[PDB]
Amino acid sequence: VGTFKAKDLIVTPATILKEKPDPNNLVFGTVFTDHMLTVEWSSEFGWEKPHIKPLQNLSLHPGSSALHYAVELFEGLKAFRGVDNKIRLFQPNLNMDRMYRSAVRATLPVFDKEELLECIQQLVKLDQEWVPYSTSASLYIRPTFIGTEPSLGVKKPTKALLFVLLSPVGPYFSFNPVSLWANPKYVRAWKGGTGDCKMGGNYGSSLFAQCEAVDNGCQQVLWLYGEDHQITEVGTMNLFLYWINEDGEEELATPPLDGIILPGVTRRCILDLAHQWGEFKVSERYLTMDDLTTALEGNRVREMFGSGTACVVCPVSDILYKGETIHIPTMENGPKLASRILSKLTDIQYGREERDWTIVLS
Amino acid sequence: VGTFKAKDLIVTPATILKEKPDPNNLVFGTVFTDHMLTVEWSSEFGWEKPHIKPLQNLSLHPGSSALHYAVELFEGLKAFRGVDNKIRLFQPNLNMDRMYRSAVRATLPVFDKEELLECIQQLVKLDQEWVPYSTSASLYIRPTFIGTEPSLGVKKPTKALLFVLLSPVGPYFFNPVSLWANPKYVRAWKGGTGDCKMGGNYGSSLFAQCEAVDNGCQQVLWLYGEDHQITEVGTMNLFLYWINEDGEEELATPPLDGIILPGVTRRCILDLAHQWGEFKVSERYLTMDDLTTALEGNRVREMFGSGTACVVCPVSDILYKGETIHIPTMENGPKLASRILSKLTDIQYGREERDWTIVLS
Numbered sequence: 152v153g154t155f156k157a158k159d160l161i162v163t164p165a166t167i168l169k170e171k172p173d174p175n176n177l178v179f180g181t182v183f184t185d186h187m188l189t190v191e192w193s194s195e196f197g198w199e200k201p202h203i204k205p206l207q208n209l210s211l212h213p214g215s216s217a218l219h220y221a222v223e224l225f226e227g228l229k230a231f232r233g234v235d236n237k238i239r240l241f242q243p244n245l246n247m248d249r250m251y252r253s254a255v256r257a258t259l260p261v262f263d264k265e266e267l268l269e270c271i272q273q274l275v276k277l278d279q280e281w282v283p284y285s286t287s288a289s290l291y292i293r294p295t296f297i298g299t300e301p302s303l304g305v306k307k308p309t310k311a312l313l314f315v316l317l318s319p320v321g322p323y324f325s326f327n328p329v330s331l332w333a334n335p336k337y338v339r340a341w342k343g344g345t346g347d348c349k350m351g352g353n354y355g356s357s358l359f360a361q362c363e364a365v366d367n368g369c370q371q372v373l374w375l376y377g378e379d380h381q382i383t384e385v386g387t388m389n390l391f392l393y394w395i396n397e398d399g400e401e402e403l404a405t406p407p408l409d410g411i412i413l414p415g416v417t418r419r420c421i422l423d424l425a426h427q428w429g430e431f432k433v434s435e436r437y438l439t440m441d442d443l444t445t446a447l448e449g450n451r452v453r454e455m456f457g458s459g460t461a462c463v464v465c466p467v468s469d470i471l472y473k474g475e476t477i478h479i480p481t482m483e484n485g486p487k488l489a490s491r492i493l494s495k496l497t498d499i500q501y502g503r504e505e506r507d508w509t510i511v512l513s
Numbered sequence: 514v515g516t517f518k519a520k521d522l523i524v525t526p527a528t529i530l531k532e533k534p535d536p537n538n539l540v541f542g543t544v545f546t547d548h549m550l551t552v553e554w555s556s557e558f559g560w561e562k563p564h565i566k567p568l569q570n571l572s573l574h575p576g577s578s579a580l581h582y583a584v585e586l587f588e589g590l591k592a593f594r595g596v597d598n599k600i601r602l603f604q605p606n607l608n609m610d611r612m613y614r615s616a617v618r619a620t621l622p623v624f625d626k627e628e629l630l631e632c633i634q635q636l637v638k639l640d641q642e643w644v645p646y647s648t649s650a651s652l653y654i655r656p657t658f659i660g661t662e663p664s665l666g667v668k669k670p671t672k673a674l675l676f677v678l679l680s681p682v683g684p685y686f687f688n689p690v691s692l693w694a695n696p697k698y699v700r701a702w703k704g705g706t707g708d709c710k711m712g713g714n715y716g717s718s719l720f721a722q723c724e725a726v727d728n729g730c731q732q733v734l735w736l737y738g739e740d741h742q743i744t745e746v747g748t749m750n751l752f753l754y755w756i757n758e759d760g761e762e763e764l765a766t767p768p769l770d771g772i773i774l775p776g777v778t779r780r781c782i783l784d785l786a787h788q789w790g791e792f793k794v795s796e797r798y799l800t801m802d803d804l805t806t807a808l809e810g811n812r813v814r815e816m817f818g819s820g821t822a823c824v825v826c827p828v829s830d831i832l833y834k835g836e837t838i839h840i841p842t843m844e845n846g847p848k849l850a851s852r853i854l855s856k857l858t859d860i861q862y863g864r865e866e867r868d869w870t871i872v873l874s
């Protein structure tokens with residue numbers, strides 16, 4: 152057991168540089184930077200030294216287990232160029248904590264979280280001119296970790312690769328509210344499954360549901376669970392509901408961490424904000440379609456929104472379910488809370504206000 | 514171009530051929546033959562021509578969606594060298610049907626099933642001396658299909674690679690196995706993708722499979738629901754031979770309700786067992802309680818797995834809730850299991866005629 156170490160970094164700088172794109176025209180996940188990070192591991196010898204080097208294709212044995220049995224996991228986080236022109240990461244240690252836990256769930260080897268973070272910082276620092284010059288764009292950071300065992304046995308891999316990609320991305324907006332496809336025939340995650348980790352195999356199974364959703368005029372899938380049709384998540388975002396609850400109290404509600412919900416960083420931040428403001432009840436609790444339709448009949452719903460790293464906050468206007476369109480009155484209610492959370496988090500990400508949630512580049 | 518064709522195959526033979534392994538030293542899945550099949554697809558241009566070429570690494574964009582969101586799926590079938598020295602496939606059209614259906618569910622591009630089986634046969638023929646000269650060994654064929662979309666959004670890929678590897682194998686692991694049963698982990702769920710061979714179903718199973726080895730088990734027995742239904746034996750279908758609750762002799766296996774892989778072996782064994790008509794045959798739910806109550810009454814004769822890699826794998830023991838639960842499979846012959854193994858191998862190795870085999874092209 153052990154870890155690679157950032158002090159052993161080997162840097163092979165590119166000698167031909169790609170042109171930076173316009174920050175207003177960026178499509179998500181499609182343009183990549185000049186460099187990547189790579190680190191090899193074998194059970195025989197452990198972790199090899201980390202490399203930063205020019206972006207390149209991966210050379211993989213076709214029997215690699217990432218390709219047959221989904222022995223894989225990823226993370227997502229961002230670097231933000233401040234109004235003061237300092238580049239900041241936001242809650243990055245939470246992503247490392249999650250990554251490590253995911254590795255263990257997947258049977259990939261463990262590593263030292265602080266050491267990975269430092270390696271990420273030096274990567275971003277080398278490609279730092281790729282962090283956009285714009286207050287509603289950013290650099291998305293994709294750490295990825297795959298089994299490369301050359302063998303078709305289903306088992307723990309004895310070889311693996313950890314790598315990191317960088318991709319400048321732009322605003323999810325200029326506030327666009329979404330319609331949701333709620334079809335109970337599909338289930339993202341089950342008790343005793345891996346839905347509370349960022350493991351590749353949770354996502355394969357959902358491209359078909361996203362396609363069905365667009366064919367019916369919807370932008371995202373609302374994931375339902377169990378016999379009472381609990382509402383769990385929105386696409387790949389956590390779900391919040393701002394309403395007057397069944398006892399007539401103003402409440403922010405979100406599903407609890409009971410194994411079928413991914414514990415988002417955004418989710419966490421929001422809950423901490425809500426707790427600290429102390430202005431309404433905050434509840435991690437079960438929410439069903441009927442709870443929801445009953446609330447709508449009695450004018451109790453203020454706002455519904457997704458949260459996650461790509462969107463930050465994503466207002467919901469409509470849910471399609473049992474052959475009908477159910478309107479959600481989010482945009483008619485400001486959306487006051489959603490806009491508050493958005494301006495608070497973006498103020499922090501871009502250094503418009505001080506916070507312990509940000510780290511300035513190393 | 515909506516589908517590739519076998520007649521466009523481009524064959525690049527290898528310069529130096531590797532030495533074949535010993536048929537009685539084979540570790541499943543570890544030795545590969547001289548050549549592979551590869552077919553590139555893109556949204557814009559459709560399917561490129563298929564190529565048979567030397568086994569090589571794949572060169573993949575690190576953004577490739579197979580690596581991030583498990584946009585991927587596979588199959589598993591076998592070629593068998595006959596006692597008559599004719600090489601045969603076993604119900605391969607069923608694997609093609611299943612691969613196509615799973616592609617549709619993965620949002621991978623569709624392909625002409627016949628043309629793929631033809632390409633596969635041409636790949637086997639070129640590597641035919643790898644089909645081992647032994648009647649307890651075979652050549653494993655591994656069609657595999659991955660998204661190679663170089664962009665990070667979760668979406669239908671606009672680039673894909675279809676490839677086939679071949680691997681000589683003996684057994685997968687009568688060697689009876691012991692099974693680890695921990696209901697804390699679930700393999701697949703209703704409204705999920707457990708009824709197809711998508712790579713995501715296997716990623717999540719690994720932790721449990723390691724936990725099984727830590728306890729001296731060879732496999733995981735997958736349990737489901739609050740009543741602890743017994744679903745599958747690792748990656749094999751599960752069969753139970755017993756006296757049922759109405760006092761009838763019965764072969765039982767879980768029904769195809771979404772959480773169970775519809776194995777080719779499983780379907781053969783049910784056909785055989787209907788054909789013999791010596792005992793009841795039921796696709797029904799079975800629980801750990803059904804099992805332990807039956808054992809207490811000395812009602813259980815045999816329990817075994819069945820899948821391509823291991824056609825019949827008997828089960829002696831299950832570890833559950835801190836106890837070991839002995840299963841008396843090996844002290845009842847195991848007659849049924851042996852009858853089944855002997856018939857399927859008779860067919861697969863050509864000792865009898867059958868509509869389930871196809872002789873190599």
Ligand SMILES: *Cc1c(COP(=O)(O)O)cnc(C)c1O
Nearest residue numbers: 387388389413415416417459460
């Ligand atoms: C990544 C992800 C989220 C959002 O998590 P953040 O850490 O806030 O970006 C939500 N749900 C699912 C299923 C996810 O994969």
Ligand SMILES: *Cc1c(COP(=O)(O)O)cnc(C)c1O
Nearest residue numbers: 748749750774776777778820821
């Ligand atoms: C492959 C597989 C089977 C049986 O497969 P065959 O087509 O009979 O080889 C059963 N269960 C699971 C989970 C599998 O992956």
Ligand SMILES: O=C(O)CCc1ccccc1
Nearest residue numbers: 387388459460461462667
């Ligand atoms: O970050 C989010 O809003 C959802 C998580 C996500 C983002 C990009 C690709 C896959 C998952």
Ligand SMILES: O=C(O)CCc1ccccc1
Nearest residue numbers: 748749819820821822823
């Ligand atoms: O054939 C089986 O019994 C299960 C299918 C399988 C075999 C080997 C590796 C992955 C899946």
Ligand SMILES: [Mg+2]
Nearest residue numbers: 625626627628
């Ligand atoms: Mg045709």
